[PDB]
Amino acid sequence: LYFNPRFLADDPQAVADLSRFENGQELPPGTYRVDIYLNNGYMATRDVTFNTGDSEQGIVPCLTRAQLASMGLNTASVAGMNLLADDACVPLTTMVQDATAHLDVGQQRLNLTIPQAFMSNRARGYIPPELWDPGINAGLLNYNFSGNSVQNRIGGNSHYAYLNLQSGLNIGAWRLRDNTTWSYNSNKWQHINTWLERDIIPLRSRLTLGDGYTQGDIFDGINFRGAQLASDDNMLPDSQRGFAPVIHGIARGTAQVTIKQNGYDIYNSTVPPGPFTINDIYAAGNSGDLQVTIKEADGSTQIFTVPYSSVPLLQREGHTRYSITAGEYRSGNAQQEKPRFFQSTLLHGLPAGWTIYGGTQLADRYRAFNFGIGKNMGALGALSVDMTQANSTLPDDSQHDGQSVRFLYNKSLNESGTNIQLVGYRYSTSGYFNFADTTYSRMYNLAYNKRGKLQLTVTQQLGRTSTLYLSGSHQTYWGTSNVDEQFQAGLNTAFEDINWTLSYSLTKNAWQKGRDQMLALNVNIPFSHWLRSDSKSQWRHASASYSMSHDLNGRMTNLAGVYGTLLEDNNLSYSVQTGYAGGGDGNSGSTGYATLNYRGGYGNANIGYSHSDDIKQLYYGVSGGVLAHANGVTLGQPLNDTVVLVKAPGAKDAKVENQTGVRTDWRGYAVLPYATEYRENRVALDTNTLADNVDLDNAVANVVPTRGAIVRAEFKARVGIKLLMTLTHNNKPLPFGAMVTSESSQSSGIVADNGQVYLSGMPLAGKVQVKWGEAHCVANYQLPPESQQQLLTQLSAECR
Amino acid sequence: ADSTITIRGYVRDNGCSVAAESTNFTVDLMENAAKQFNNIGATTPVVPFRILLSPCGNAVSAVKVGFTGVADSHNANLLALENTVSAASGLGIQLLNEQQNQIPLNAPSSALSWTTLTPGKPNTLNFYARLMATQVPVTAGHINATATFTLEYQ
Amino acid sequence: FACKTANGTAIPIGGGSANVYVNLAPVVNVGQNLVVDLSTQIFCHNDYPETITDYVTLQRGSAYGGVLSNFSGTVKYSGSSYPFPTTSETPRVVYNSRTDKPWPVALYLTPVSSAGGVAIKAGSLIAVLILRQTNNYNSDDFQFVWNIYANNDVVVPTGGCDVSARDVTVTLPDYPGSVPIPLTVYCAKSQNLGYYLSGTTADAGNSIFTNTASFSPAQGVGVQLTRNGTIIPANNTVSLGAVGTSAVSLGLTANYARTGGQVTAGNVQSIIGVTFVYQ
Amino acid sequence: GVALGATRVIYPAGQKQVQLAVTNNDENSTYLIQSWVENADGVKDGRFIVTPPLFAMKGKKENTLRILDATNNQLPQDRESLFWMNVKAIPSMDKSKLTENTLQLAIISRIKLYYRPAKLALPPDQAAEKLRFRRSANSLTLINPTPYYLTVTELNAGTRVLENALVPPMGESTVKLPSDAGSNITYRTINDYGALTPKMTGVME
């Protein structure tokens, strides 16, 4: 690994600085402090201490056994991994065969290559728990304020006001949240929720203490106050949440497997000879069946179809989900009594796509058991049946036994047809009472209980664009004869951009008499394809909406409006519409509504005028969030649960890319309004909008937040000047590629040609040291204070 | 049209990747010592040096191939070997095209002529080498030669 | 006892029926409180307050329309709280003054958890209250049927939710490249939601969108959108599941695809629209 | 060995930096690349700066060279300047094999960098429309009055095909027109991105 200096230049002296690049250029320092990229994939950056040993560079970077296991290495796959101590250095070069480790100080790269055999099989998109950041110790407040000044023909002196406050703390892993509301009419307080949450990573569960609600999957979703331990699918890998059958196969040799659906590939991989089971296929839902094609080395192919159907109460094979909730019961109505209840629900998976679930509910005056089986039939579809037994007691102190049976059916007939979504039938006996009706009062809608409920959902596809949605709910009662009916039908189409929708709804309540019909038509026409691509058109992104409604009883209502944006970065939105109503009740007139909402770096603000025949109100609202932490207090948009604290000392008015006007605050801090939980999040700043005198070290950062947590996104910036120095030594130019390092800062550079050196982030005056062989120069340079205005600076300096 | 995504990004026509083939000298001062005249050299440093252009781009039609390096003091049309203790005096490398026509070293850009190139297919260019001398005795030993060929694109 | 209203309608002696229109709150979100003040609408006086004392109370109250379909709550009478719609006799009120006095009755109505759209339509009756008036002088009893209707429509806030980063751009790296696009959508009210993509197409399968560049477009290549490593054709609704307060990521990635034959160079650009569909 | 990302690299006035991709294919060898900008006259003027002026590369992976702007607005604004970007690649050799006598060549690639002043009059896409030709006794002179650098090739006047040449703006380029050439002359111009624009025909001014 030697390079001839004659190639670089014809000068016999040339430069000896190429000697540093001839060999591997091992760093003598133990602390490499280089980011590690294993199997060509970056994992993390940390200070790694290198120990002397037989390595490519002569120093083996010591890595913890636990760190290697978290990175992807398997302890069982490599012999001797368990014998070594936890704090003992892991000799990956010797213990793991065909393991290569290299270090690059200039690029700060720790290149690690290991065989795929030593790495265990993992689901797609798996994120190690180590990268999950629990958050920072910080407070959080979110305020929303709305106000109305409705004026009418009689008694029009009205002014309403609503003020919603959401407070929270993030001390350690614990999260605390509280809600409050103020109502003002022309000053009554209110209280809603207080709760705290913790995430048990080893158990992959969540503990909630305070107010909350339970999942409505098995029992009716109810509001409680107490302790809840619940298993969530968010902590699971992205390619493993939902329902997807496990696929087993036999491969004659090293074959290629491709599973596809709906005419498109859903997954592909290579399989060694033998038996292989795959379970990392994404949750298709109701897209359709799956086709598996295996191509062997000899060219033989085996193709087979696996059916796919998922009722909501289904789980993946070999997976369990539980939810327990204990404590007092808070209905929300002051009349209802508040007893103590304990509920425990569990769902478990069995091979061949089976599921078994069971739920228990206990209280002082209630005992309910439920046991059900969800079986994936396959070609026919999927069906789940459950039976619930209850022994309740009405407030009149009279015991009542009851049973209930629920059937759920789903299918995916997308193969040249329409796929239904849900067919549900619930049948209850004469004495089955839910937990809500047991505690209506102490010492009423309990006169009639639900007897039969039928739910039907159908999605039909006509052509490529035409869609038909059909929904139907039918409810009976015991003793009485009135039946609740809710029917909805909808046609959706689009020619190129114009959107057509036609809805027809029928409603018949239980206590009420007479069916009410509602037929509506809506057409959306964007004003984009009708105009040329003009940068300064100022009419782009605008669209017109046409709405027509008919109650079928003799009332006509029409609405025509236009909406769009009128700002440089779409921070403002406007929508003006005019209406026309007639018939029916008799009231007629020309309706009108003009709304304008601006989203900025401080807080959203909306103003809206409404004009009608005799009703006119003005909506004025301001909403914003504030985050308090160790480094200070930053304002911003309403913080929506997970938020990223963009930190960048030096960039005053930097704008975050791919966000609606999220600008850094006056000190340079910012808060991201919406952040995705348990997933990789990329934050990037528009360097074009950054200050010309400030250069960012890195314009892209990756953060993986946990739910209800605040994660800092560091962004270091340098406010130095860019300089083109012409260094000379002994009245001669410096040799090619001489390394120049600034003493004041961490900047460094390489000699380009004719003694020219480019340095970035340099002060107005300072000293540098340039070396090429075995510190030849120590030079200094002072510049006038007016040089800061100039974008680039050129000057000359010698050495001693 | 709740939100519109404007995908953008340019695609660039990649150039031709060329990897030179190292030329090894194994004369071992056999023919050079026997001649001992150095009037026209000894043709000992003769080799068919090959340069492979693949995979080329889609729009690369014609390129200019030139040569440059250290010119021999004795002969201006030949490239001298690197000075060394074991360097063979009275020996220099000269190059010629497939038509056995000598290519001047360090020639001007306008002097060179355009060379056609087959688009989208691998290509190989072969050039012959030769040994030249004017007036010096053969010293045998190791021979080191440094030269660079310029591939000027369209 | 004679009862009158703000308008010309009045209840004479011996009972009767009357209709009163009340303007309620026009803006009310989920969990909001609605107040209907019937005190400032009906005023009753005693025909013979000198020697006859009247006992007036609300015998019953039936809710009609959305009040009985999308709301419930309580009724306040002289500080006492009863159900709404009511099912019990209200406390008696003593009237022995010649001057008319407001009826101490009000309604505190909260919407149900399924609130949405126009809760109560303007111009329709909201409730019917039957009040029994009795006197200690004799056994005479009168029934007053007050029909409380609404003159201003009230629309509960269903919740309109928008998508972050409207008019968001992205750039591919070179010809072989792939870039995820950030697009997160959140809604204050949990509901089912899906998204479908629209734009110009190149092939029959509606998979690769055409290149509409203006400065020497590179023919023979187009832009493709992939979700979870799967090609997403245009006009194909994709189930996003249940989206709550926590924003969910669309998880789309921009890639290249081949449309024609020879691959040129210089520029590609495609315009892609996304549209949301509920249920 | 070393493959350049683009044959032509452009530089618009007012921008800070431009990027150029460099890829390696011989993963079994290590190549060191040095980059430098050069004036049209051949001098090594340091009017342009390469941030990584010299570094090595191992295996096969892509790097991004960067070009700055150090002209200080000291260039004509009515014309686009021309410079030569040179990338020199030097290979490695085995230490043991260095004893044997051998000759090794070096890989150097030259590309044309155009410094384009801002606020151009003619459209860059439509700049190829303007063209003038003059037929001399034994030569052909091509003059392009457009304020752009136009590269012409496949110059086929009749049966005979003239050699490719580069014309400068506000000037004329002379080529040896064959005696047996025809009347009509066919030329193909090369755009900024390097795509081959369709053939066109012109007339004498």
Residue numbers in the entry:
A (entry chain D): 2 to 187, 196 to 452, 474 to 804, 808 to 833
B (entry chain F): 1 to 154
C (entry chain H): 1 to 279
D (entry chain C): 1 to 205
Direct quotes from the study:
Type 1 pili expressed by uropathogenic Escherichia coli (UPEC) are tipped by an adhesin, FimH, that binds mannosylated glycoproteins, including those on the surface of bladder epithelial cells to facilitate attachment to and invasion of bladder superficial facet cells. Assembly of type 1 pili is facilitated by the FimC periplasmic chaperone and FimD outer-membrane (OM) usher in an ATP-independent manner. At the usher, the Nte on an incoming subunit displaces the chaperone’s G1 β-strand and completes the subunit fold of the preceding subunit in a canonical (antiparallel) and energetically favored manner, termed donor-strand exchange (DSE). X-ray and cryoelectron microscopy (cryo-EM) structures of FimD–FimCFGH demonstrate large coordinated movements of the five usher domains involved in catalyzing DSE interactions between neighboring subunits and extrusion of the growing fiber. These structures also show that the two-domain adhesin FimH, which consists of the lectin (FimHL) and pilin (FimHP) domains, adopts an elongated (“relaxed”) or bent (“tense”) configuration prior to and after secretion to the extracellular surface, respectively.
Here, we report the cryo-EM structure of a quaternary complex FimD–FimCFH, in which the FimH adhesin is in a previously unseen location within the pore of the FimD usher during transport. The FimD–FimCH structure had a reported overall resolution of ~3.5 Å and was essentially identical to that published previously, while the FimD–FimCFH structure, at ~4.0 Å resolution, revealed a previously unreported assembly intermediate enabled by DSE between FimH and FimF. Unlike the previously determined initiation and elongation structures, this complex reveals FimH positioned halfway in the usher pore. Remarkably, during this stage in secretion, FimH adopts a third “relaxed-stretched” conformation involving both an elongation and rotation between its pilin and lectin domains. Thus, we termed this conformation “relaxed-stretched. This conformation is adopted by FimH as it spans the entire OM while retaining contact with both the periplasmic and extracellular spaces. In this model, FimH is linked to FimF through DSE between FimH and FimF. The chaperone–subunit complex FimC–FimF makes contacts with both the CTDs and N-terminal tail of the usher FimD. With the engagement of only two pilin subunits (FimH and FimF), the FimHP domain is partially inserted into the TD pore as FimF, having undergone DSE with FimHP, remains bound to the chaperone FimC and held by the usher NTD and CTDs in the periplasmic space. In contrast, the pilin domain FimHP undergoes substantial reorientation (a rotation of 84°) to be compatible with its residency in the TD pore. During secretion, FimH is obligated to adopt a third, “relaxed-stretched” conformation, in which the two domains are maximally apart from each other.
